[PDB]
Amino acid sequence: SEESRESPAEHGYYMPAEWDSHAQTWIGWPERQDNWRHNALPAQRVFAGVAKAISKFEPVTVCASPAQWENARKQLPEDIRVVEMSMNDSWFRDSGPTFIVRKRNRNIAGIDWNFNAWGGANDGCYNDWSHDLLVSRKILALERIPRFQHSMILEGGSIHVDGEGTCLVTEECLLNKNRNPHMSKEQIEEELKKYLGVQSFIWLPRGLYGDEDTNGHIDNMCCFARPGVVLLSWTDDETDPQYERSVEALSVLSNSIDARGRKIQVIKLYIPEPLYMTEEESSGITQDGEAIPRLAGTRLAASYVNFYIANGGIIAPQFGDPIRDKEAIRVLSDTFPHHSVVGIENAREIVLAGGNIHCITQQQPAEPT
Ligand SMILES: OCCN(CCO)CCO
Ligand SMILES: [Cl-]
Ligand SMILES: [Cl-]
Ligand SMILES: [K+]
Ligand SMILES: [Mg+2]
Ligand code: NA
Numbered sequence: 095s096e097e098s099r100e101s102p103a104e105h106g107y108y109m110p111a112e113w114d115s116h117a118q119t120w121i122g123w124p125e126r127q128d129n130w131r132h133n134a135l136p137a138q139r140v141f142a143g144v145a146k147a148i149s150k151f152e153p154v155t156v157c158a159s160p161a162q163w164e165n166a167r168k169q170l171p172e173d174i175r176v177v178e179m180s181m182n183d184s185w186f187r188d189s190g191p192t193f194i195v196r197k198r199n200r201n202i203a204g205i206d207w208n209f210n211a212w213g214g215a216n217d218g219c220y221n222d223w224s225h226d227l228l229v230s231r232k233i234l235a236l237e238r239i240p241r242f243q244h245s246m247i248l249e250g251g252s253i254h255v256d257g258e259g260t261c262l263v264t265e266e267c268l269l270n271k272n273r274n275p276h277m278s279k280e281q282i283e284e285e286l287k288k289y290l291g292v293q294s295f296i297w298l299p300r301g302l303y304g305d306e307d308t309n310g311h312i313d314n315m316c317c318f319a320r321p322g323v324v325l326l327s328w329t330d331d332e333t334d335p336q337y338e339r340s341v342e343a344l345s346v347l348s349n350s351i352d353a354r355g356r357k358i359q360v361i362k363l364y365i366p367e368p369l370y371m372t373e374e375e376s377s378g379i380t381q382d383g384e385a386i387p388r389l390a391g392t393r394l395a396a397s398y399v400n401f402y403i404a405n406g407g408i409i410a411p412q413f414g415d416p417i418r419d420k421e422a423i424r425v426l427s428d429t430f431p432h433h434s435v436v437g438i439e440n441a442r443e444i445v446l447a448g449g450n451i452h453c454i455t456q457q458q459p460a461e462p463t
């Protein structure tokens with residue numbers, strides 16, 4: 095669609111860091127049988143666990159399709175709000191609004207990016223995203239929060255900010271011809287400065303190995319822990335295709351400076367021992383000719399970097415790895431000493447459909463007064 099006549103930055107807005115205070119978290123509800131095994135029941139139960147864990151820290155709203163509303167309302171505790179919303183799949187980091195705030199009429203707004211199911215008619219993950227195109231408008235209308243609209247295609251999982259002017263992104267995703275092939279790097283930067291209130295960029299060339307379907311979203315590779323400090327997906331195994339990506343990202347990060355002129359300190363957050371979809375898993379997924387196939391043997395895009403920050407809580411995946419799960423809890427607990435770190439077992443169930451906890455959440459900042 096078209097772009098708002100004035101940008102967020104013209105009105106004083108910017109995207110705050112994820113660790114700033116939230117009013118609530120938004121989460122979708124999975125259902126489609128060609129992405130979620132066994133009629134989505136195992137994933138529904140893990141989404142409900144993620145939502146419940148977040149609800150201990152802050153309010154949660156789960157949005158569920160007309161067909162699923164009663165099921166979601168049964169599976170969620172009563173203090174989680176459940177609302178009806180049509181969607182083509184349940185990845186609200188990507189299809190939901192990117193909220194923005196200001197200091198100095200409302201002091202919160204949301205950005206409704208364009209969307210094409212991570213690469214459109216050619217290269218997208220499913221063939222119909224027309225419900226997804228309305229999710230951001232519907233969420234913002236629910237909350238009576240003003241909306242800015244962009245014509246640019248963007249997913250929230252592809253951008254990360256420190257709240258101090260820096261934006262961390264991947265070239266693999268935002269420069270892919272399947273997103274905005276009419277725009278240069280410089281033009282994409284200009285739009286992100288105007289809409290996120292950022293001044294400078296850190297461009298990692300590639301995202302996580304195994305995340306070809308999003309084209310290497312930043313949120314599954316590297317994120318800020320606080321200004322000047324990032325967590326980076328890591329392996330020491332030179333035989334894993336991940337290694338060359340991690341080493342290249344570390345080299346870029348060690349030659350980067352943030353928008354306020356700090357060097358970037360990197361904390362390595364080790365990926366689990368490689369995970370692969372099993373035949374039993376793949377056999378529970380339909381092939382209706384509407385979505386990409388989910389095949390036995392696929393390397394899962396599993397990284398503990400795909401955690402979510404809530405008010406006083408870190409909600410982190412657990413993948414069953416007998417050392418990396420506990421290492422991730424420890425590293426995150428040390429890196430966020432004022433937060434409680436909660437692990438979600440069976441996060442694998444989300445990773446079978448190509449993302450994890452961070453991909454299924456969208457924070458609504460508290461509105462500054
Ligand atoms: O399958 C649609 C959603 N999926 C895309 C990558 O497989 C994970 C969310 O980014
Ligand atoms: Cl609207
Ligand atoms: Cl826990
Ligand atoms: K894709
Ligand atoms: Mg949108
Ligand atoms: Na219930």
Ligand code: NA
Pocket residue numbers: 390391
């Ligand atoms: Na195999």
